[PDB]
Design a protein around this motif. Structure first.
Motif, short mmCIF file in Angstrom:
data_model
loop_
_atom_site.label_atom_id
_atom_site.label_comp_id
_atom_site.label_asym_id
_atom_site.label_seq_id
_atom_site.Cartn_x
_atom_site.Cartn_y
_atom_site.Cartn_z
N UNK A 444 28.74 71.53 76.81
CA UNK A 444 29.84 72.29 76.22
C UNK A 444 30.88 72.65 77.27
N UNK A 445 32.18 72.54 76.96
CA UNK A 445 33.22 72.99 77.90
C UNK A 445 33.34 74.50 77.90
N UNK A 471 24.50 80.51 72.28
CA UNK A 471 25.43 79.42 72.55
C UNK A 471 25.94 78.80 71.26
N UNK A 472 25.05 78.63 70.28
CA UNK A 472 25.48 78.09 68.99
C UNK A 472 26.51 79.00 68.33
N UNK A 475 29.81 78.77 70.16
CA UNK A 475 30.58 77.60 69.76
C UNK A 475 31.21 77.78 68.39
N UNK A 476 30.47 78.38 67.45
CA UNK A 476 31.01 78.58 66.11
C UNK A 476 32.26 79.45 66.14
N UNK A 478 34.37 79.51 68.66
CA UNK A 478 35.41 78.63 69.19
C UNK A 478 35.93 77.69 68.11
N UNK A 479 35.03 77.13 67.31
CA UNK A 479 35.46 76.24 66.23
C UNK A 479 36.27 77.01 65.20
N UNK A 480 35.88 78.24 64.91
CA UNK A 480 36.62 79.05 63.94
C UNK A 480 38.05 79.27 64.40
N UNK A 482 39.65 77.47 66.60
CA UNK A 482 40.31 76.17 66.66
C UNK A 482 40.87 75.79 65.30
N UNK A 483 40.10 76.03 64.23
CA UNK A 483 40.57 75.72 62.89
C UNK A 483 41.71 76.65 62.49
N UNK A 486 44.83 75.55 64.25
CA UNK A 486 45.39 74.34 63.66
C UNK A 486 46.17 74.65 62.39
N UNK A 493 43.88 72.00 72.04
CA UNK A 493 44.97 72.54 72.83
C UNK A 493 44.98 74.08 72.77
N UNK A 495 42.76 76.23 71.87
CA UNK A 495 41.51 76.78 72.39
C UNK A 495 40.68 75.63 72.95
N UNK A 496 40.76 75.36 74.26
CA UNK A 496 40.10 74.17 74.80
C UNK A 496 38.65 74.39 75.19
N UNK B 291 32.60 73.68 57.49
CA UNK B 291 33.15 73.25 58.78
C UNK B 291 32.49 71.97 59.29
N UNK B 298 35.50 68.82 65.88
CA UNK B 298 35.41 70.01 66.71
C UNK B 298 33.99 70.25 67.20
N UNK B 301 33.33 67.97 69.85
CA UNK B 301 34.10 68.35 71.02
C UNK B 301 33.39 69.42 71.83
N UNK B 302 32.91 70.47 71.16
CA UNK B 302 32.26 71.56 71.87
C UNK B 302 30.82 71.24 72.26
N UNK B 303 30.27 70.13 71.77
CA UNK B 303 29.05 69.59 72.31
C UNK B 303 27.76 70.15 71.76
N UNK B 304 27.82 71.05 70.79
CA UNK B 304 26.62 71.66 70.22
C UNK B 304 26.53 71.32 68.73
#
Ligand SMILES: Nc1ncnc2c1ncn2[C@@H]1O[C@H](COP(=O)(O)OP(=O)(O)OP(O)(O)=S)[C@@H](O)[C@H]1O
Ligand SMILES: Nc1ncnc2c1ncn2[C@@H]1O[C@H](COP(=O)(O)OP(=O)(O)OP(O)(O)=S)[C@@H](O)[C@H]1O
Ligand SMILES: Nc1ncnc2c1ncn2[C@@H]1O[C@H](COP(=O)(O)OP(=O)(O)OP(O)(O)=S)[C@@H](O)[C@H]1O
Ligand SMILES: Nc1ncnc2c1ncn2[C@@H]1O[C@H](COP(=O)(O)OP(=O)(O)OP(O)(O)=S)[C@@H](O)[C@H]1O
Ligand SMILES: [Mg+2]
Ligand SMILES: [Mg+2]
Ligand SMILES: [Mg+2]
Ligand SMILES: [Mg+2]
Lengths: 539, 539
Positions: A444-445, A471-472, A475-476, A478-480, A482-483, A486, A493, A495-496, B291, B298, B301-304
């Motif tokens: 994960x970045x 960690x899960x 990430x969720x 971050x994905x939230x 990110x969406x 968008x 971009x 949220x990298x 999601x 995504x 991308x975040x790897x998880x």
């Protein structure tokens, strides 16, 4: 178009094994006379459907250079009573007349089912005739009889005897490397886009036999046609047809491989770097598993045979499953996992130990033993004990058990000669928790503002699984965002990486899965499992 | 009168697949030649009785433009042994002689039952001959063999292999749209009154396969004739014969569809508007289910990888079934519901999971899990665990469980990778109660004097089921008053809406279903399910 060895992939070992028994005697007959060998004359190929054992037959037919006669099971059984007997008899007679020869009986189970369980009288007569013909092959006659069956246990036991089919080769489920070999073979005549990385498809095609991989390549081509046809034949379109990675991933998603439920005997991909924390257990597992294989002479020097049974026990989510996979990976030893629920859902426990024996260095792992204890269960456990006793320590088959409930584990499994090496896997300490988070966040970045040291000291008493959940949940978040980012860009971009703020939200509702009271109980059994084998508190 | 694609309704995707696998290669052979994919040669149509697979065969026969040969299993098996063998052989020979050709074997299970379970020898010979003929079809030969069965598991497994009926298409139970299509097809030649709304009939005809809908139309027309004749042929009566909505509703009431007990895999009709006050859970379920499907990029991308398992738990009657149905609806994902009693009443769990896999985005819901815990139960739970462990997180099948008894839930189901996303559904608060009452009273006319806020304040501690019960009691009071007013009018609208007096009467004997002590216990288990997987309170 004729099939050869180059058209078979994933069974390099098996093909060389067949060549040594079909081609080598003929090329160098003087080798066997010089040493006095009884070369095998009965070979049985077995494996799940679609693994390429009829393909191997076609390869040997076109490559051996010896007279090849093919007997099809259904073809013989489709004939009348008299005509099935004659075809079998004519098969062997022609072979002896044109020695050296190979007789291949495809679908042997169709011709030779268990006589006790066979109903018709004609069917039982065919089985008897085959035994007579097999026994009628003289040593001088250079006739090798090959057979293929996907139901080896359905064959008459009389045929699987000395002099009859006595060498069995398993054309089994290919591994990741083998899957890539098959995909390359089946994509030789398919146009592929420059973005096609068959290595990734092979790694993701779990449970796929070569027959399934052939379908996957075919389906991906159809999906490529679908995309073009839907938009639209012009020669520009025909020349633009090239299966892309998207088509392969689409085909892989829709695929329903037939070998998903088959037991896997491949080397795991889990390494020590996936665990990190349990330094002392890593060293102990190496001595118990690695040393007997790498340095067998030293054990013979000191005169004491190693014990090849281990039991992991401890709180849930602390890496017992990972440890069993990592150790097999370090030794490059096969790995068979049999979770406790599988055992209860199932003469089939005997098969598992048979598979482990075939895999020469093999780690036989019995995960989730607590299910058996919490529960058929008596039959399963007693069968395990009998098989463990039948497994000699001189064979490189290592048995590992894992239980989250050391309080209800039968003491018979801890008897010397059985899972007598007791390793306790505790909750990680603060230093260990740092390594677990680093291990979990490798792919994960993560932003530079995330301090794993801070997370480790905040997750006191957290099991390794709990840290993965953080960690899960990080990430969720971050994905939230990110969406959400968008949507704003499209509606008007960003949220990298996974910043610290995400981990703050992830840890807001996080709670340890193992209570301190439970930890006290586990530490008690770290001192009393060795002693839970006599009267104990039963009287 | 000849059957074509226009006479088939509901199975549009399956017809497209059949066209792609049959017609499209012949129209554009160069299209397949360019990409190096050889079209398939074995298609098996399967589904419950009456779904229209013989109809599909007739349509392909009349529309494909290739030589069509029909083999009826009962017809073959009605002949003597040699006659049946010769008929099969001649079928395949003629098909090869007139390529391109399609051989359709209707009722393949009649020809090819499981050989192990087949008693007669002639049956086994016929099965073997069919296998031999299937294997005898060369790649050059343009012969596509089609088969249809309503008992796919009764077919010989050898016939469902690669190079044999290796492509299976399910002509299954139609949904409401498909039911409407079928009803429109079967009402083309039936006179309909202007008040006939086939949409309502299609919506109300649950468990109706196309055959049941044809029978429904026939019975409605018979009911129209019956009503007209009971009064009484005069031409006026003949020209006054038009099927009315009353006839359709009568036929639907008297109809006994054959697919009632078949599992449904359709998208549910429950939306968020049917739930209301569970906003946080709605957002969480969106993140968990929507999601991964909408934004796989995504996650990659975040790897998880995302977890595909959820567990609803909480006091009874709080909307755990509604949540699963609504989340399935929002994602437009298929929904399979299996209740605990169904599981205990049943090799069938594997069937459920296979159905879930076939439905690409699917929410597989296991409701009333408390039944298993209160209880066969061990076998069911172990099978569920094994199947969950065989469902990869990379496939879009989401598993949801619901239990009103978190105190007796087996901890193995909460293991990471299994239903590890624990969501607690509490009793609604005042605002949630207001939203529940608003949702439940959408279809019912309500007088302006009814204050839903007052009802919410009075229904403290009430579950959603209790509020629905209050609404039902109010409606019963309204119906009673309407009937009494009608009787008074006849013996010598008065009640157009459900007034607040009706709600006062309903609330008189209304008591909460979840006691405060039970609420305390549920609130405590909202903290201890994550920790109910180790020793716990067992030592
Ligand atoms: N190891 C393999 N390498 C390359 N292609 C393979 C392999 N295994 C299967 N295939 C392909 O998939 C097809 C499967 O056909 P078979 O070889 O007859 O399968 P099988 O091993 O005979 O299984 P059964 O028991 O006969 S159903 C082959 O014709 C190949 O096209
Ligand atoms: N030491 C560890 N290092 C890294 N990840 C870990 C560690 N322990 C646990 N995990 C994570 O937790 C998951 C489950 O751990 P396991 O290896 O199954 O331990 P366990 O003894 O099997 O506990 P359960 O009951 O299976 S959760 C792993 O897949 C990892 O994601
Ligand atoms: N999808 C459909 N669309 C339109 N009419 C249908 C459909 N399915 C069934 N029917 C009608 O119902 C009749 C019965 O369907 P069939 O296709 O003959 O039965 P089936 O699908 O073969 O089921 P079994 O297994 O053979 S009993 C057809 O002849 C049509 O009149
Ligand atoms: N939040 C809610 N909003 C609207 N109606 C609800 C709600 N909760 C419950 N209901 C009503 O109560 C009925 C039963 O609710 P369910 O969805 O079955 O909840 P549950 O968790 O399954 O509890 P049980 O044991 O099945 S009654 C629904 O069909 C609705 O009529
Ligand atoms: Mg074969
Ligand atoms: Mg584990
Ligand atoms: Mg039919
Ligand atoms: Mg419910």
């Amino acid at each position: 178009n004729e099939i050869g060895y180059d058209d078979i992939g994933g069974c390099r070992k098996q093909l060389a094994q067949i060549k040594e028994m079909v081609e080598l005697p003929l090329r160098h007959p003087q080798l066997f006379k010089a040493i006095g060998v009884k070369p095998p004359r009965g070979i049985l190929l077995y494996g799940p459907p679609g693994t390429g054992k009829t393909l191997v037959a076609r390869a040997v037919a076109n490559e051996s250079g010896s007279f090849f006669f093919l007997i099809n099971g259904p073809e013989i059984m489709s004939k009348l009573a008299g005509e099935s007997e004659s075809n079998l008899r004519k098969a062997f007679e022609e072979a002896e007349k044109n020695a050296p020869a190979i007789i291949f009986i495809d679908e042997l189970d169709a011709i030779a089912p268990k006589r006790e369980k066979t109903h018709g009288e004609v069917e039982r007569r065919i089985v008897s005739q085959l035994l007579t013909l097999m026994d009628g092959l003289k040593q001088r006659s250079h006739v090798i009889v090959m057979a293929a069956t996907n139901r080896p246990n359905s064959v008459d036991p009389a045929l699987r005897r000395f002099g009859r089919f006595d060498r069995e080769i398993e054309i089994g489920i290919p591994d990741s490397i083998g899957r890539l070999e098959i995909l390359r073979i089946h994509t030789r005549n398919i146009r592929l886009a420059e973005d096609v990385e068959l290595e990734k498809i092979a790694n993701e095609a779990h449970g796929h036999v070569g027959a399934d991989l052939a379908s996957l390549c075919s389906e991906a081509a159809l999906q490529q046609i679908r995309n073009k046809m839907n938009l639209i034949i012009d020669a520009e379109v025909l020349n633009s047809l090239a299966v892309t990675m998207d088509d392969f991933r689409w085909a892989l998603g829709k695929s329903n491989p037939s070998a998903l439920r088959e037991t896997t005997v491949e080397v795991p991909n889990v390494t020590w770097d996936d665990i990190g924390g349990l330094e002392n257990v890593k060293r102990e597992l190496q001595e118990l598993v690695q040393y007997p294989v790498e340095h067998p002479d030293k054990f013979l020097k000191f005169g004491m045979t190693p014990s090849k049974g281990v039991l992991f026990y401890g709180p849930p989510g602390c890496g017992k499953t990972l440890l069993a996979k990592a150790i097999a990976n370090e030794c490059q030893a096969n790995f068979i996992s049999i979770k406790g629920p599988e055992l209860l859902t199932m003469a089939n426990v005997r098969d598992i130990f048979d598979k482990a024996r075939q895999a020469a260095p093999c780690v036989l792992f019995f995960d989730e033993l607590d299910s058996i204890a919490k529960a058929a269960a008596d039959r399963v456990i007693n069968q395990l004990l009998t098989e463990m006793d039948g497994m000699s320590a001189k064979k490189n088959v290592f048995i590992i058990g894992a239980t989250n409930r050391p309080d209800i584990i039968d003491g018979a499994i801890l008897r010397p000669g059985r899972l007598d090496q007791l390793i306790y896997i505790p909750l990680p300490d603060e230093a260990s928790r740092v390594n677990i988070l680093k291990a979990n966040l490798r792919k994960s970045p993560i932003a530079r503002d995330v301090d794993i040291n801070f997370l480790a000291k905040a997750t006191q008493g957290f099991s390794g699984a709990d840290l993965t959940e953080i960690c899960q949940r990080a990430c969720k978040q971050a994905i939230r965002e990110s969406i959400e980012a968008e949507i704003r860009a499209e509606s008007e971009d960003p949220v990298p990486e996974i910043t610290r703020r995400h981990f703050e939200e992830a840890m807001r509702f996080a709670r340890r899965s193992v209570t301190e009271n439970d930890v006290r109980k586990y530490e008690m059994f770290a001192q009393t499992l060795q002693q839970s084998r006599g009267i104990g508190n039963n009287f």
